[PDB]
Each structure stands twice: as C-alpha cells, then as structure tokens.
C-alpha cells in the first residue's frame, strides 16, 4: 500500500528524452522550478521535457500511483522559447499522439485578468489572477525573447 502522497508535476520527477547528436540534463533549483542546460549541434535536434503517468525509472518500493485522469487541472509556468509564438505540447493518448499549441498570456492592469496575446489566431479565454503565483527567482530579462 502507498504510505506517502506526491504532488502532481513535482519538479524532481520530470525526465528528458532527446535525439542523438545532443547533450542535455535536468536540474531543479527551487520548490517549483528546474533548469535544462542544452548544447545544440544540428537542425534535427529535438528535446522533450516529459511527465510520465507510469513510473518506470523507480525501484518497486519507491514507485508512485498511475492515474490517467487529468480533469479540471490548470498548469501555468514561465519559459524561454526561441520562437514564443510557436510553442507546442505533445499530449499522448492511447489512440493517438496529439499536438497542442501554447499561446502567451499577458496581464491586463485595467481588467485584472490574464488575457492572451495573438488576437487574430488564438484562444479567446481569459483567466483570473492567482492562476500564477511567483515565489522563486524570475527568468533574467536577457534570456527571454520578446513577442508582441
């Protein structure tokens, strides 16, 4: 029987899978954050930071539960895309592997809601504050890429 509870999307339990001809590793640095140093060499380089429902890399006495149900869950974070407008996530169901596009969201001081940028082609949903709560050190402005 399980005797301990693990938060979903815990920074210590992510894994990285990438092609050959590339070197990268994963390192957490806070209660909510981690870093993935990279070294690129070719065009075909492609890296993936994954959260797997099924635990395969743990000893039988340290594994965690497998619940495939993600209903009513919201995950918000910060990142450093080289192309901020074109950022995608590969969500894999047993029937097929889908690709979902993530669009940037920006705070609106007049209405106090996280409204998306990219008005022409984007989601038309707006989210409350308190979706994103910042307690770690932010990304340096030099590393971030500017969009809109």
């Amino acid at each position: 029987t399980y005797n301990t509870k693990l938060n979903r999307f815990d920074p210590e339990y992510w894994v990285v899978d990438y092609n050959a001809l590339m070197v990268a590793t994963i390192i957490p640095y806070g209660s909510k954050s981690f870093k993935v140093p990279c070294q690129w060499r070719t065009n075909k380089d492609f890296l993936g930071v994954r959260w797997m429902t099924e635990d395969t890399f743990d000893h039988h006495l340290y594994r965690y539960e497998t619940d495939p149900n993600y209903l009513g869950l919201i995950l918000a974070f910060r990142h450093n895309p080289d192309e901020p407008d074109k950022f995608t996530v590969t969500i894999q169901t047993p029937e097929k592997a889908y690709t979902y596009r993530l669009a940037p969201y920006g705070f609106n001081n007049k209405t106090r809601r996280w409204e998306c940028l990219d008005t022409k082609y984007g989601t038309k949903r707006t989210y409350q504050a308190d979706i994103f709560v910042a307690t770690d050190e932010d990304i340096p402005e030099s590393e971030m890429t500017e969009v809109y």
């Binding site: 050959a20 070197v23 990268a24 590793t25 390192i27 140093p37 990279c38 070294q39």
Partner: protein, 208 residues
C-alpha cells in the same frame, strides 16, 4: 581539440556539481572512471587505432566506438585534462580526491562481429614509425591478420614492445594527473578471467 584546456561541456559539469554536492551532504566517497573510447562519429581520425587493413577498430554497439592508441600523447593529454577537470570540482568541496584509469588495452577483433573479426588493431603508421625510429629493426612481415592463429618467432619482439608501451601509457596518465593534483589516489580495473586464462598467447603477451 588539442588547444582547449577543458574538454568537458556545460550540462554534464552542472550535473556533476550537484551530484557531488549531494554525495558530500551524506558522507560518501567518489571514484571517477574515464576510459579510452570516444564516439566513432566525433573522434579525430589520427588518434584512432587501425586494423591490419585501413579499417578502424569499432566496437559492439549500435553507435560504434573507437579506441585511443596508447602511443599518441595528444589523446592521453585529452583524457588527463578531463580527469583533472572533474577532480577540480571534486576538490572545491571538502572532498577527498580519488580517480580510476579504466579500460587500457590493445583492441582485438573478438567482440566485433564481422568486418575484421578476430583481427588485431596493432598496425598504425605512427606506431610503426616509432618502432622503426627506436630499437631499429622493421615491422614483422606477413602481418598477423588473425588473433587465433599460430605466431611465428620473429613477431614476438614487436609484441613485447607494444606491451611495454601499453604499460607506459597508463603511467604517463597517472603522473600527469597526480602532478597537477597531489594527494590523488590512482587505481586500475583488473578483470580476472583474461588475466588467469587469456583468449590466446597473443592477447596474454600483448595486453598485460
């Protein structure tokens, strides 16, 4: 490649820094092994060992690997620089310094399946030139071409010289590393089945 002092990249170095910090928090000791192989695709061509024909060593992996020739000094400098780079971060924390020199030998064709099976990788132009330069003589004629074959008596002087150079290479690496970092404790990896019972006389006289 020979010019750069630090041959280890960034992600591995950060991973090793955090790894060593964690191993230091819970009292533990670290021993790092750096071997002769480097990936075949990215290896320099002059360092690679060569077969009786022109083909390089290769190995039994889906990505093939090639082995450093012991006679070359640049490759030994590369390996010792990597070991010193790791030992520096080991030294920055309050940790003792240990290191291991792993997998020194003259490659044979036993593990490789096809394309030079059971073919020794002795013959390289630079090593042959070294043999001509010192102790005189010449490389033995009809090259061995097969490890599991009878060996003529005029070939043994070459094998003994190769074994002496193999012994000298690890000593050079140890001297470099301990000179840069005193108090380090070197070691080796001895695998016994071939020590007690080698695959053949050639292997026993060549790799030990």
């Amino acid at each position: 490649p020979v010019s750069e002092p630090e041959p280890i990249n960034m992600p591995t170095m950060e991973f090793y820094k955090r790894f060593l910090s964690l191993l230091h928090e819970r009292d533990m000791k670290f021993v790092n092994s750096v071997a002769y192989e480097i990936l075949n695709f990215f290896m320099p061509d002059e360092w690679k060992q060569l077969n009786w024909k022109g083909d390089p060593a290769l190995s039994g992996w889906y990505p093939p690997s090639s082995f450093i020739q012991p006679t070359n000094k640049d490759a030994l400098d590369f390996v010792s620089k990597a070991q010193c780079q790791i030992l520096k971060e080991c030294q920055n924390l309050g940790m003792e310094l240990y290191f291991q020199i792993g997998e020194p030998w003259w490659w044979d064709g036993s593990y490789n399946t096809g394309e030079g099976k059971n073919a020794p990788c002795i013959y390289d132009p630079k090593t042959m030139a070294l043999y001509k330069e010192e102790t005189g003589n010449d490389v033995p004629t009809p090259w061995i071409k097969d490890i599991f074959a009878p060996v003529e008596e005029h070939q043994w002087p070459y094998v003994d010289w190769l074994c002496t150079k193999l012994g000298q290479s690890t000593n050079y690496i140890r001297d470099y590393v301990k000179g840069k970092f005193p108090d380090a404790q070197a070691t080796l990896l001895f695998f016994t089945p071939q020590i007690m019972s080698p695959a053949s006389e050639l292997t026993g006289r060549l790799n030990f």
